[PDB]
Amino acid sequence: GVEIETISPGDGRTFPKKGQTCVVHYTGMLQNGKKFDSSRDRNKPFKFRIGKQEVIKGFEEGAAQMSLGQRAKLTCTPDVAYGATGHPGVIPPNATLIFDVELLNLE
Amino acid sequence: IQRKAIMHHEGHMDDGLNLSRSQHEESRTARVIRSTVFLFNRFIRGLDALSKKVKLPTIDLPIESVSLSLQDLIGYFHPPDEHLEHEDKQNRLRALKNRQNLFQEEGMINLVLECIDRLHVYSSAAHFADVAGREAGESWKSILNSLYELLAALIRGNRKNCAQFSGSLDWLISRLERLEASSGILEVLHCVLVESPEALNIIKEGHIKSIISLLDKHGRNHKVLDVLCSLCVCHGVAVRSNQHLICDNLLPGRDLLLQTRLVNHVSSMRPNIFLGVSEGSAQYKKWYYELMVDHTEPFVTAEATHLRVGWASTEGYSPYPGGGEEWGGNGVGDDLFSYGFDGLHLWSGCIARTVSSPNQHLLRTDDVISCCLDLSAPSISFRING
Amino acid sequence: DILELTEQEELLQFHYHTLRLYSAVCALGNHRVAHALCSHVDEPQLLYAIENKYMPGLLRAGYYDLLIDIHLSSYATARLMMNNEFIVPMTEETKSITLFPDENKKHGLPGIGLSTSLRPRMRFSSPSFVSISNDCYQYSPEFPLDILKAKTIQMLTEAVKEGSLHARDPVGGTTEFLFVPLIKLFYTLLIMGIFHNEDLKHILQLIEPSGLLQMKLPEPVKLQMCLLLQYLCDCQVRHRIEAIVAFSDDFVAKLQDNQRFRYNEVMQALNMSAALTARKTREFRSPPQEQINMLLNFKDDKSECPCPEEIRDQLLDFHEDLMTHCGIESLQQLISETMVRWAQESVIEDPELVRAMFVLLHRQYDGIGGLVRALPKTYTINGVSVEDTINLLASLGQIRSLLSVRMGKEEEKLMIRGLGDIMNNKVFYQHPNLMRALGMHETVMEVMVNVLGGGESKEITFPKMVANCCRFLCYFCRISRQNQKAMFDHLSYLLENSSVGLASPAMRGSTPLDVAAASVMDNNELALALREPDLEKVVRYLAGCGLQSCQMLVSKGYPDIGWNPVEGERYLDFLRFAVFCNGESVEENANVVVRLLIRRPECFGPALRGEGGNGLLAAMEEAIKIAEDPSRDGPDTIHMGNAIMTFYAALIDLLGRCAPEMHLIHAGKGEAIRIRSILRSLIPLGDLVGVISIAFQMPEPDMSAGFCPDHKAAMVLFLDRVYGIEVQDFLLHLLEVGFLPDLRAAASLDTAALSX
Amino acid sequence: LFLQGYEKSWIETEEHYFEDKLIEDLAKPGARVDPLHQLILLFSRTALTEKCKLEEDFLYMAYADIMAKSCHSFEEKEMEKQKLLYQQARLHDRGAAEMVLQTISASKGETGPMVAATLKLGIAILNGGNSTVQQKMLDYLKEKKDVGFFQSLAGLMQSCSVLDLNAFERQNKAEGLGMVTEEGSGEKVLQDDEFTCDLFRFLQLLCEGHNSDFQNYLRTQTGNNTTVNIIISTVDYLLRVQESISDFYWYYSGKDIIDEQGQRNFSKAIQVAKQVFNTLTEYIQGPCTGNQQSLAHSRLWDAVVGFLHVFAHMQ
C-alpha cells in the first residue's frame, strides 16, 4: 500500500536486507501538511532494524525499497500504519501519512 | 435520635431548660430564608399553574418582586473587597460562610434548581412572552441570569455545599448547551470543580465530550480552557483518566486549538523587467531566461530550504503584486499572481502538483533551468537541463 | 506571526490559556501525554520561544512552564523528594572528602566538590511515533541538556546586564516576565543535577562578587532567589553530612579494634575477682546502642571512658572543625545580610515571600538545626550493595509518585508491583532501620487511608489495593522489634475503620485488624502500653457484630441468623492477641477485658448469654446440625454452622487465655480469684465437658469446614486455666467421656491421614 | 550506631547563643515598618486567618522560642531589672502582646506545641509585674469582644494533666518485667506538666501586682455575651490534682519505700499544685470581694481538706 516518490537519487546500489540496521533521517507529516513528527529537530538520526517488527510496516516496507543516500516521499495508507484506531493523542483514526525519509547509512 | 416533646402534668425532673440567644446575623438569616422560601414557592406555583396546561391567568407571577429579591440576594453573598482591612475581610468571610451554611442546610439550592428547571422548559423570550405575558417574556432571560448568579454565589467558597450538590452535575452539563445561560452554567461548573475533589470523581467521558463540543460550537472561549485545567488537577493531585480523556478528545484532530509551527524566512529577487501586452504596442509576447546554481543545501537547520523560480504577475499595471503580504513563508507559486517551479511540483496558488520529467529531482547544485514565456496563446514553460 | 499577538488581546489570552492547559494535562508524572504534547508543539519551537526577545510575555512564561513540565518536572520532583534522605556508601572514593576544606583561611564553595551520595538516576526515552509498540515510555521525553544549559547561562548573563541599567523595555513586557521564568528554569536545571563544578563556579560568580542580589528585584523574583539560596544551603548541609560520615569511618576503624584489643588484654590478664565480672558484663550485656552511648561521653572533666584516650583528642578536633565549618564562632554572611536588607528596604506583601525569607534567616542563624534534623535521617550501608538499594529507592520514589496521584486501576497495579518489588528486595531485611528512617510505613499508611476514605459502610472499593498495603505493613512490623512500636502509633487510627475487609474469606491475612494484631503481637511492653481508649471501642464493635448480621451476607443469600459470627470472631482474635502474650496473660488487660465484656453482655453469643438459648452444648450441636443441613447456608461459601462454632471457640479461647494465671498470683490475690469466679459463673463446667465430648468422625477425604478438631483445644485450654485438673474422679470421668473416643479415632490410622 | 549516638548526645548540647543578637539586629531600621514588626504582623495575620485547626507552623514554633529566650549590690540588681523592661519593650510595642493573645485564641483549647510555645513567649514578655503589657492585653481584649480566648483558656485548663495511678503502676510492672527505656514526657504518667505550669504561670502574671481590672475581667468578661469563669476552672483543676495526689499517696501506704519514680512523679505534682495555689493567691491577693465570694462559694474547701488529710500523714 505504501508508495515511494523519489526526491533525490541514492545511486540505487545498496538496499536494506533482512538482518541489518538502517540509519534514516525523516520528517513525517500528516496528509494536510501538519507536521506531527521529525528526526531533525532532536538532531539525532533514527536507527532501526529490518524485519524485527519494531517500526510500522508503512515505514519499513517503504524503507526496504530505497537506497543509501536516497531521499524519498513515502505515502502510506491508514490500515498499514495505524488502522481505524490511530495513535491515541496524535494521529486521528483513518489518517494517511507522508514521510520525507533520507537514508544516511545502511549497516 | 428524636425524643418527642409531649406536654403533660407530671413530667420528668431532668429537663433543665437553658436559654441561648442567637446573634443578629443568624436571626436575620432565618428571616430572609423564610421570606425567600415563601416568595419562591409562590413563584413556583404561579409558573406551574401556567406551564402545566392552559388555565385562566388569575395567577400571582411576582416578576419584578422576584427580580428585586434576586438582585438583593445576589449582593447578600457579595464576597468581601480586598482593598479592605485584613480583620474586616476575615469577619466578612466568616459571616458569608455562616450565611452559606444556613442557606444550604435548608435545601434551597435544590429549590433554585427546580426554579431553573421550570424556567428552562421554554426556548426564548419570544416563546415565553406569548404564554406568560410581555413583561414575563422580556424578563425571563434576566431572571435566569440572576438565578445562575445566585447559584454560583451560594457555592463560591464553601467546600461542603459543592460536595453535597455534586450529585446534580449530570443536569448542569446537560443544560450546558442552552446557548442563553452557557456563561452562568460554565461559571457554576468551574466554581464547583475548583473546590471539591469529590465532584471530579463522577465526571465521565460524556461530560468531557460535551464540554469539548461546547468549545467547538461556541467558538474560542478562554473559560472552557480553565474548566479543563481544573478538571485535570483539583488540589495538588491529578486524575489520569480525565487527563487522558482531554488529551485524546481535544487535540488529535488539530482543528482546535490554535496550532503552531516553526517555518523559515524566504525572500524573492526580481530584475527591473515589466511585460505588458495589450492592443497596440507589443513586445513580441515571447521571453526566455536561464538560471543556474552554485551551492545549495537541502536542510540547513530544520526544514527543506525553499527554492523556487518562475514568473509573477502584478495588480493592474503597478508594482507590489498580490499574495503573501510580506515577510512570510510564501515565495513564488504561493498565490494566484505567481507561477513557480522547484524541480518536483508546479506551484500555483499555494497548491503543488507533481509532474513527470526525465530524472525528476530537486534543484541540486550545478542545475540549469530555462524559463520560457509566451503571452497570448500558450503559457509559461520550464525546461530542466534542456 | 507569533509576535503579532502583542496587539491582538483575544488570541493572546486564548493561546496563553492553551499553553496552561498543555502544561496541566501533563503536570504530574504522566508521560503518555507528554510524549504527545512534545510533537503537538515542537522540539525546537520551545528553544526559539525561550530565546526570542520580542515575546508577548504571557506566551514566554507559558512556553517556559511547558518546557519545564514536559521534560524537567518529573525528574526534578523525583530528585527533590529524596533531598532530605542522606544515604551514603563506604566507598574508597567516599573516603576522600574527610578534609572538607575549612582551615588555612578558606571555606570552599557551595555545591563544589564530591557527592558520593545515593541519588535517583535520570534517563529519558526518545520520542518516536513511527516505532510501533513502545516498551514503556516510563520516564520522560528526551531533550538536549547541554544546549539548554548553555543558553540558560547566556540569557541569564544578558538579563543581569540589562537589569543593571534599568531600561524601560524588559524582555516580555515588565521585569518580572523577564526574570521569573528564567530564574525558574535555572533553578530546576540546578536541581536536576547539571552545572558541573566549573559551570557552578561561573553561576556563583554571577551573584557572589563582593551582582544579582544587590539589584532592585521584584517580589516574584526575590521569591525564587529565596529557593535558590535554600538549595545552596541544602547542598552544604549534605556536604557536611558526607564529611561527618567520612571521618566516622576512620574513627570507628580506630575505636573498634582498640576496644577488642583492650578486651583481649583484660581477658588474658584475668586476675579473677569480684569486680572483673562487673567490668566484663559490658561485653555480653549492654547491647551496642547503650554500649556506644556509654563509651562515647567526654564533655565534662572525666567519665568512665576506656583506655583509648588518643581518639578522644581527634574527636574533639573534628568537633571543633564542624563547629567552625558551621556558623558557630561565607554564605551565611551574605544571606543574613540580604534577608534583613530587603525587609529594611521595604515592607513586603505576599506573605509567602516573607515566610521563606525568615525561614532562610533562621536556618542560617541556627546552623546546627539542620544537622540535628538530618542526622537521624542519614544512613550508610556498604560499597558492595549499591544496585539493590538503588532499585529500592527507585521503587520507593515510584510509590510516592503514585501516592501523589488519585487512585485508579492502573495506579493500583503500579503500586502493587512496587510493593512486591520492595518486599522482594534484600535490603528490606538486611537494613530494617533504613525503612524506618525513610518512612516507608508512613507512606503506605497515608496511601491506604486514601483508599479507605470516601465512605465508611457504603464502599470498600480497591480491595486488592487495601490488601497489598496491609500485608506489606504486616511484614514490615513482623521483621523487627522497633517497627512494632512504630506501627503501634498508627494502631489507634486503623481500629476505627477496622470493620472493612471482614465478612469475606478472601483476606484471612491482609486486614487492618490483622495488622493491629501483628503490631501488638508478642511484646509485653506494647501489650502493657496498650491502654483503654480503644478496648471499649473493640468491645462495642463486637457487641454490634453479635447483635446485627451482615447485610452483605443476607444479600448473598445466607439464612439471616440473628447475629454475625465472622467480624465477631475477628474481634475476638484481636482481643486474644491483646490479652495473651508469650504464654502469660497480662493481668491489667485481662481484667479490663472481663469488665467491658460483663458491662456489655451483648458481646457473648445469644445462644450462650441471654434469656433465650441455654448454652454451649445446644449451640454447638445446632451449629453442627446447620452445617450438615445445606438449607441454612449460601445456595467456598460461608458455612454458617462452622462460622458459629469458630466464633464460640474463639470466645472460649479468649476467656481461657484471659483467666488470671496458673495460681502464681491467684494463690494470694483477691481480684484474680474474683475474675476466676466470674468466668466460672459465666461458663458452666457441664457445658464444657459436654462440648469436649462430641467424638467427631475420622474420614477418600472429607471437608474440614465443620466441627474442626481445633475447636476442642479451646475448651481444653479453658478447662485447664479456669478450672484445672486436681480431682481424681473428675480426671477419670473426663478421660472416659471426652478423651478415649478421640484417642481411638486418632490411633486408628494406617495411610489415610488427611488431618494432622 | 556511632553517628546515631553522636547526633543524640554530642551536637544538641547547647552550643550556641544568638537569641539576643539576632533580635537586636532584626529590630534595626537602617533604611516604615521594622523587620521584626513585619514578622509579628505575619504571625498575627496567620493566627487571625479563619480556619478549623491550628496548624503546626514550624516557623512560628521556631521563632517564638527565640523571641522568648531573647528576654532574660543595688545597681547590679537595678540595671538588669531595667534591661529586662527594655528587652520586653523591644518586642511588646511591635504587636507581640496581641499576637500571643490571638495565637492562644486561635487554638480553641487544643493542647499542642503551638500553645506550648506561645505560653512561654507570654511568660518571657510578662516576666515581672509588667503593668504596661497587662494593660495593653486588657485593652485589646476589651476593644475586640472575643470569647474565643477565654473559652480557649477554659478548654486548655480542662485537659492539662492528672497523675494517673494505673499508668504509673503499669510502667512499674513493665520496668520490672524488662529493662524498657524510660519515657520522656514523665513516664507517660504526667503529660505536659511543664505546659501546665507555664499556663498557670501565665494566668498568674496576667493578674500579678494588684491589677483589679484584670482580676475582675477574669471572673466576669463584662461586655461579652457568653462570659466564662476562669477562677472556677482553676478551682476545678486544683480539686482534680488534689484527688490525684490523694490517690497517689494512698497507693504508697504501708510500704515505707519511695523509689526514684515515686519521688520524681510526686515532686512534679507538688510543683504543679504549688503553681496553682500561687495562681489562686494572685487571683485573690488584692481585696477583690468578687473573687473572694467566688472562691467561698465553690469546691475549694474539698480540695483544701484533702490537702490537709494528705499532709497530716505525709509529714
Curated annotation (Swiss-Prot), chain A:
Keywords of this entry: Cytoplasm, Isomerase, Rotamase, Sarcoplasmic reticulum
Expressed in which tissues: Detected in heart muscle (at protein level). Isoform 1 and isoform 2 are ubiquitous with highest levels in brain and thymus.
Protein origin, superkingdom: Eukaryota
UniProt-recorded name of the protein: Peptidyl-prolyl cis-trans isomerase FKBP1B
Transmembrane domains' residue ranges: none
EC numbers, comma separated: 5.2.1.8
Organism, scientific name: Homo sapiens
Cellular component, GO, one term: membrane
UniProtKB/Swiss-Prot annotation, chain B:
Post-translational modification: Channel activity is modulated by phosphorylation. Phosphorylation is increased in failing heart, leading to calcium leaks and increased cytoplasmic Ca(2+) levels.
Summary of the tissues where the protein is detected: Highly expressed in heart, lung, cerebellum and brain. Detected at lower levels in adrenal gland, stomach, thymus, esophagus and ovary.
Disruption phenotype: Embryonically lethal. Embryos die at about 10 dpc, due to defects in heart tube development. Cardiac myotubes display enlarged rough endoplasmic reticulum and cytoplasmic vesicles that contain high levels of Ca(2+).
Subcellular location: Sarcoplasmic reticulum membrane
Residue ranges of domain B30.2/SPRY in the record: 213-386
Description of how the protein assembles with itself and partners: Homotetramer. Can also form heterotetramers with RYR1 and RYR3. Interacts with CALM and S100A1; these interactions regulate channel activity. Identified in a complex composed of RYR2, FKBP1B, PKA catalytic subunit, PRKAR2A, AKAP6, and the protein phosphatases PP2A and PP1. Interacts directly with FKBP1B, PKA, PP1 and PP2A. Interacts with FKBP1A and FKBP1B; these interactions may stabilize the channel in its closed state and prevent Ca(2+) leaks. Interacts with SELENON. Identified in a complex, composed of FSD2, CMYA5 and RYR2.
Protein function: Cytosolic calcium-activated calcium channel that mediates the release of Ca(2+) from the sarcoplasmic reticulum into the cytosol and thereby plays a key role in triggering cardiac muscle contraction. Aberrant channel activation can lead to cardiac arrhythmia. In cardiac myocytes, calcium release is triggered by increased Ca(2+) cytosolic levels due to activation of the L-type calcium channel CACNA1C. The calcium channel activity is modulated by formation of heterotetramers with RYR3. Required for cellular calcium ion homeostasis. Required for embryonic heart development.
Similarity section: Belongs to the ryanodine receptor (TC 1.A.3.1) family. RYR2 subfamily.
The record's note on its domains: The calcium release channel activity resides in the C-terminal region while the remaining part of the protein resides in the cytoplasm.
Record-given protein name: Ryanodine receptor 2
Organism per entry: Mus musculus
Taxonomy of the source species: Eukaryota, Metazoa, Chordata, Craniata, Vertebrata
Gene: Ryr2
Full protein segment contained here: 387 to 772 of 4966
